[PDB]
């Protein structure tokens, strides 16, 4: 939904048996070197922990695994609720030129981050863009950005305008 306003439709389907405490980590976030980030970050060359990914196309997803709101980028942030194959149960029960969104990410019940989007092409910000990785070191900032990307805490906040014309706040590092 536009305007960044979701009322009740987010699916509250999250697990608790596991001791990882992903939900318990919402209140506070650790430092860059305090969470073993570089060990995982070294999986991709400098020049879904980093931009090096091959997200697949996702049409529909069962709500039994969704944990938290599903944020998507027009690139301007947008939230999509559960839907009948409008049900108000809290989950208990395409490129912008062609419509919809290229891709986005969500947080599952098991407690891991998974992403899906458009297919890679073959350099641009409106043709091959699939996820929030607008640039190699720039992300589309949204309120729940830290939760899905705890390793980007050190990134700075920058205001950018993209061309329709979109005004949004992005996070980039030095």
């Amino acid at each position: 939904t536009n305007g960044s306003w979701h009322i009740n439709r987010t699916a509250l389907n999250c697990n608790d048996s596991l001791h990882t405490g992903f939900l318990a980590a919402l209140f506070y976030t650790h430092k860059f070197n305090a969470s073993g980030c570089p060990e995982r970050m070294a999986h991709c060359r400098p020049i879904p922990y980093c931009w090096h990914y091959a997200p697949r196309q996702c049409g529909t997803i069962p709500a039994s695994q969704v944990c938290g709101p599903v944020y998507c980028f027009t690139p301007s942030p947008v939230v999509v609720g559960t839907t009948d194959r409008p049900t108000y149960t809290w989950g208990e029960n395409t490129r912008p030129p062609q419509g919809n969104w290229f891709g986005c990410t969500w947080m599952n019940s098991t407690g891991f981050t998974k992403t899906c989007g458009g297919p890679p092409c073959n350099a641009t910000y409106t043709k091959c863009g699939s996820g929030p990785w607008l640039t190699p070191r720039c992300l589309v900032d949204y309120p729940y950005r830290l939760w899905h990307y705890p390793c980007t805490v050190n990134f700075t906040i920058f205001k950018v305008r993209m061309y329709v014309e979109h005004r949004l706040n992005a996070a980039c590092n030095i």
Partner: antibody, heavy 111, light 107 residues
Framework: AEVKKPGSSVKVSCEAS????????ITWVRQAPGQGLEWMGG????????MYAQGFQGRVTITADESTSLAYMELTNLRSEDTAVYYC????????????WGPGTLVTVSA | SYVLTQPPSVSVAPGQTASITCSGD??????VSWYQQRPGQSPVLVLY???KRPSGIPERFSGSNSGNTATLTISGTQAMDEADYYC?????????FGGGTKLTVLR
């Protein structure tokens, strides 16, 4: 003003989301006179989940109603050691620091 | 259990600088934040994320976090700076507030 009889229960109320995006985490902190601050628990309006401190595991209870957009905590079995001033705070979603501390609420007993 | 320790009190004269330390075990790997509380008033945030100060607080206040000691530095202290200072940190999914530090200015 009055003495909350021992073994009774008390509640503290904080403003909460009416059933929409919150963009804050509500937590409660108490202060015995001049003895510093202590933490009790937190409650994200967006997520039904909550968090309880180890010390007060058996006496606190956090519940909120979206109809009135008001959240409150229930403390039971008050004792002489629980006399203190109760604060309410609201900070950013994930910055790990609480801002905009509300007014103080005083609760007293008589042993 | 985790504990943060602070000196009970500190004394300085106007125009000088006072150092307040919130030390602990491997405390340099956590984000700290300091709270200033005048008597009879609710605490007001003075520092979040070590050094990034909020808007409104005068530039005199400055702090840092490193090693096992995190310090808050005040320069040009005046008669309006008398207040208790509290330290904050997260550990094992449990908030911990440091012992009250009383900063006094001798006139």
């Amino acid at each position: 003003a009055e003495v909350k009889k021992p073994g009774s229960s008390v509640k503290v109320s904080c403003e909460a989301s009416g059933g929409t995006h919150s963009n804050y985490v509500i937590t409660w902190v108490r202060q015995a006179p001049g003895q510093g601050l202590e933490w009790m628990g937190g409650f994200i309006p967006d997520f039904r989940t909550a968090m309880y401190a180890q010390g007060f595991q058996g006496r606190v209870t956090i519940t909120a109603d979206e109809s009135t957009s008001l959240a409150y905590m229930e403390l039971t079995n008050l004792r002489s050691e629980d006399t203190a001033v109760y604060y309410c705070a609201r900070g950013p979603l994930s910055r790990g620091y609480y801002d905009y501390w509300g007014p103080g609420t005083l609760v007293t007993v008589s042993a | 259990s985790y504990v943060l320790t602070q000196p009970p009190s500190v004394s300085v004269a106007p125009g000088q600088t006072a150092s307040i330390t919130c030390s602990g075990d491997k405390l340099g790997d956590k984000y700290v934040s300091w709270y200033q509380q005048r008597p009879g008033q609710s605490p007001v945030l003075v520092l979040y994320q070590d050094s990034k100060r909020p808007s409104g607080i005068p530039e005199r206040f400055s702090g840092s976090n490193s090693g096992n000691t995190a310090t808050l530095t005040i320069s040009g202290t005046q008669a309006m700076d008398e207040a208790d200072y509290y330290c904050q940190a997260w550990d094992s999914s449990a908030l911990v507030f440091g012992g009250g530090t009383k900063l006094t200015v001798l006139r």
